[PDB]
Every structure is written in C-alpha cells, then in structure tokens.
Design a protein around this ligand. Structure first.
Ligand SMILES: [Ca+2]
Ligand SMILES: [Ca+2]
Ligand SMILES: [Ca+2]
Ligand SMILES: [Cl-]
Length: 294
C-alpha cells in the first residue's frame, strides 16, 4: 500500500475558483475521478500501475481535496449540477483530447458517466467500480448503511455531517475492510478539519443520490446515462467487489448487461481502492494496454 500521495498537486482557476488536480505523464488521458468523501488521494496506489501508458490525471472535486470551497456555502450548495459545471470546465481546461479513458467511482462515476454520454466521441474506454450506475430504490441501498443515509437525507443531516463529520469519520472507515493508518485518515479528513460548511460537500452528496425518485434532476440524468451505457459499444471494465456495497443486487445485475465489458472481482466493500489497489491498478493497466496497442 502506501500513505504518500501520487504526484504533486497542481492548481488552475475555474469559474473564479481554484481547483486542484494531479497531472503526470504524456499522451492520451487516463482520468481518475473520486467520489464522496474522498479526493484524488483515493487513487494514489492505483495510478502508479498506469505509468507510461498515458497522461495520468486525478481531479479534486470542488469543495473537496485541495480545491476551493464555495462560499457562501449552505443547503443549496454542492448539488450535482454545480459540481458538474466546475468539473466540466476543469476537464475542458486540461485539454484532454479525444481518446480519454475514464476510471470512476461513486459520485465520480455519476459525473464521469454523464460526461461520457455528452462527449461519447472522445471516450476510448470506461473503467468503473462501486458506481451509481442507475436510479435506485431504498430496497437496493446497502442494508447496513440504509438508516444512516435516510438520516443524512433528513433534518438530522446537518448535525451528523457538518457538526460531527460522520461521512469522513464513520462511513469512510466503515466501508474499508483493512485498517487505515494515522496518515491515511489525516489525508482524508484534512479538507474537512473545520466543523460547519467546510463539510457541506459530504452532506450534499448523499442528498443527491438518485433514490426513490428524488432528487428528480439527478434521477433523470442517471436514467439517461444508464440507458446509454446499456447500449454503448465503448469498451468497459467493471471492477466488481466482494462483498461490495453500492454496486450489488439489482444495480450489479444491470451493469452486467452492459456491452463490450470485461469484469473482475476484487475484495472490498465500497472504498475498494484501499483494500485491493494492486488488483485494481493491474486490471486498469491491462485494460488500457488493450485499448492502446503498439
Ligand atoms: Ca490522438
Ligand atoms: Ca429506516
Ligand atoms: Ca473498516
Ligand atoms: Cl454520497
């Protein structure tokens, strides 16, 4: 494993804000996108496996990692649409070209899948894991975390997350099978050390998950890329997890119907990158080598 980050953080001004990201190497991009409540740090032990296979990029979503917070922050800030506007602009500013390989997880997959559907001609391949592949129902949500997420999506959410930082301190470790080190948790809580709005992104995200028809805008967006992905011939790599968490049951059955897809199973719950980074990195690298033959 390892607690040291991959490359050095770079910064760029987007919509009057400063966003952080990792950009190492040359060639066609291999774009890694994290979800909630992580950052580019999530891919630190996976990105190395793709050394020399392309331009390795990992962006910190707005309000997360080393990216700027959006003040004034509040209940209406950090919704999917806002995150998309900033990520779209960052990805445009990075001059990615037209043969991009996406590696997505959690909210990074919702964002990545949507971007791919909108820029399909520029997508060479899609590797995904523990993703939001379609709108779901409460019965599809992981049983052990179901009540907690229903609470996030209620008035109790502010105290749980903004005051007590539950997504970072409880959910994150709770969905990783192996024990995290002091430095690893320090890296994960760093962007959220301050109580209050600094932690808003970690609360707004669960309130955006397309569950039982709400929120309607994200449900529609997910229904859109779900339908598209089920018909798209773009090569895909589905990294299934055991026991897994989000991508299980019906969603997993759905993902398994997607065309031109390779699948492997690795040990892990939700944040599988912390449990099987070498298996994941090796799979992604092989995927890319097949997509980019010499
Ligand atoms: Ca080219
Ligand atoms: Ca309940
Ligand atoms: Ca654990
Ligand atoms: Cl979430």
């Amino acid at each position: 494993l390892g607690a040291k980050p991959f490359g050095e953080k770079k910064f760029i001004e987007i919509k009057g804000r400063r966003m952080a990201y990792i950009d190492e190497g040359t060639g066609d991009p291999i774009l890694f996108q994290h979800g909630n409540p992580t950052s580019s740090y999530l891919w630190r032990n996976i990105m190395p496996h793709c050394a020399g296979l392309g331009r390795l990029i990992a962006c910190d979503l707005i309000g997360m990692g080393d990216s700027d917070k959006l003040d004034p922050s509040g209940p209406e800030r950090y919704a999917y649409a806002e995150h998309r506007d900033y990520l779209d602009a960052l990805w445009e500013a990075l001059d990615l070209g037209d043969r991009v390989v996406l590696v997505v997880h959690d909210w990074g997959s919702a964002l990545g899948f949507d971007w791919a559907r909108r820029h399909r001609e520029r997508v060479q391949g899609i590797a995904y894991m523990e993703a939001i592949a379609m709108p779901i129902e409460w019965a599809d949500f992981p049983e052990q975390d179901r009540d907690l997420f229903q609470a996030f999506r209620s008035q109790a959410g502010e105290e749980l997350v903004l005051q007590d930082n539950v997504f970072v301190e409880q959910v994150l470790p709770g969905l990783i099978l192996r024990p995290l080190s002091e430095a690893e948790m320090a890296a994960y809580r760093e962007p959220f050390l301050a109580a209050g709005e600094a932690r808003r992104p970690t609360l707004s995200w669960p309130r955006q998950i397309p569950i039982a028809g709400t929120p309607a805008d994200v449900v529609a967006i997910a229904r859109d890329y779900a339908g598209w992905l089920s018909e798209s011939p773009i090569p895909k790599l589905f990294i299934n997890a055991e026991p897994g968490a989000l991508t299980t049951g019906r969603m997993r059955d759905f993902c398994r119907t997607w065309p031109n897809q390779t699948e492997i199973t690795v040990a892990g719950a939700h944040f599988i990158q912390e449990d099987s980074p070498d298996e994941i990195g090796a799979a992604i690298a092989a995927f890319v080598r097949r997509l980019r033959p010499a």
